[PDB]
Amino acid sequence: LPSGSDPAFSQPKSVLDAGLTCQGASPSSVSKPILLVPGTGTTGPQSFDSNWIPLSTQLGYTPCWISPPPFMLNDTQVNTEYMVNAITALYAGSGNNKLPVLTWSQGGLVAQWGLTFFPSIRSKVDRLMAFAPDYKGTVLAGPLDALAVSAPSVWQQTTGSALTTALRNAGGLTQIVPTTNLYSATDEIVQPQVSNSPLDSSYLFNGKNVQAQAVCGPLFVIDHAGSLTSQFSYVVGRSALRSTTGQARSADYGITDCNPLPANDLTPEQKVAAAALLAPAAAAIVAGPKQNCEPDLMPYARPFAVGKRTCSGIVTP
Numbered sequence: 001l002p003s004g005s006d007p008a009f010s011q012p013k014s015v016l017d018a019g020l021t022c023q024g025a026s027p028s029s030v031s032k033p034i035l036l037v038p039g040t041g042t043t044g045p046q047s048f049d050s051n052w053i054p055l056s057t058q059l060g061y062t063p064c065w066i067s068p069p070p071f072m073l074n075d076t077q078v079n080t081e082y083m084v085n086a087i088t089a090l091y092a093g094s095g096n097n098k099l100p101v102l103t104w105s106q107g108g109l110v111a112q113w114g115l116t117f118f119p120s121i122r123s124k125v126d127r128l129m130a131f132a133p134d135y136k137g138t139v140l141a142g143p144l145d146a147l148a149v150s151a152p153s154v155w156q157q158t159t160g161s162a163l164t165t166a167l168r169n170a171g172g173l174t175q176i177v178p179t180t181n182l183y184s185a186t187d188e189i190v191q192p193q194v195s196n197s198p199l200d201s202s203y204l205f206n207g208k209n210v211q212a213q214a215v216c217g218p219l220f221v222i223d224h225a226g227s228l229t230s231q232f233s234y235v236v237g238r239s240a241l242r243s244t245t246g247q248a249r250s251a252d253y254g255i256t257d258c259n260p261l262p263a264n265d266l267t268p269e270q271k272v273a274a275a276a277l278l279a280p281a282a283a284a285i286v287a288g289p290k291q292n293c294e295p296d297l298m299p300y301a302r303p304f305a306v307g308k309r310t311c312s313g314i315v316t317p
């Protein structure tokens with residue numbers, strides 16, 4: 001892992017702070033915060049209003065989130081600036097207490113990029129609860145890239161990308177704080193996820209890696225959104241948030257929690273919104289920025305992806 005100083009942010013802290021909020025509180029004075037990091041094509045409320053905002057509130061936290069603009073489609077490295085700044089602010093605002101981070105899709109890649117390249121935060125994050133995290137990117141983005149219709153972060157979330165290379169070469173595929181990864185083989189957005197093994201995009205070494213089919217059997221189906229929103233996902237998430245080890249515990253869930261429907265506690269309307277979650281995010285993707293090349297790596301990450309190709313050409317030391 002990188003050690004040393006946090007890199008400077010490319011955005012002003014005023015801009016970063018404007019991307020962060022807490023439900024019914026300022027980040028500078030907040031009790032039991034949990035930072036939520038949203039998925040590609042969404043803001044915090046869009047990823048989470050149907051699920052972990054009311055679920056995490058009902059578990060006794062104050063939900064905070066970031067909404068890097070536009071809709072998590074811009075440079076993943078910039079999205080991570082929002083996250084790192086948030087952890088610094090919320091640690092201070094909760095009395096210098098460590099806080100959990102809970103994520104969906106890109107949000108987990110963001111958290112892990114943060115922990116990897118901004119060391120100051122490793123001591124401020126309690127645990128990471130990642131749903132369908134794409135630490136290795138996804139193979140599904142490749143063809144879009146080839147047509148130059150991919151957003152900046154979609155390029156970066158491509159299997160083989162300069163960004164995913166850099167993460168793994170800096171040690172980022174090993175958990176850095178106690179981490180639980182809940183994911184599914186039957187994910188239509190993030191693949192590969194089928195091995196129940198280190199090959200899977202959601203796997204971190206020494207993490208609590210929970211492929212839902214490994215617990216629920218090979219005919220259990222939750223998709224990319226259901227990975228976040230299901231009753232089985234809630235049980236695992238709850239376990240991870242409550243656990244004195246910082247990871248979910250096999251003792252806390254079993255066969256009888258293998259309900260693929262949205263989390264029981266959610267309102268009828270939240271359940272309808274949860275089941276429809278992928279539709280607005282795909283629409284935001286389609287409407288957002290698009291380019292013909294992967295955004296450059298920021299100087300701090302270039303030594304870790306020598307030889308990959310970005311907008312300015314081939315990455316050098």
Ligand SMILES: *[C@@H]1O[C@H](CO)[C@@H](O[C@@H]2O[C@H](CO)[C@@H](O)[C@H](O)[C@H]2NC(C)=O)[C@H](O)[C@H]1NC(C)=O
Pocket residue numbers: 069070074075289
């Ligand atoms: C998405 O990212 C692009 C590229 O970084 C941003 O476009 C730049 O924005 C800065 C700061 O506002 C401008 O000074 C540059 O001239 C822009 N460069 C471009 C278009 O190549 C864009 O602002 C970002 N989008 C959002 C919504 O924040």
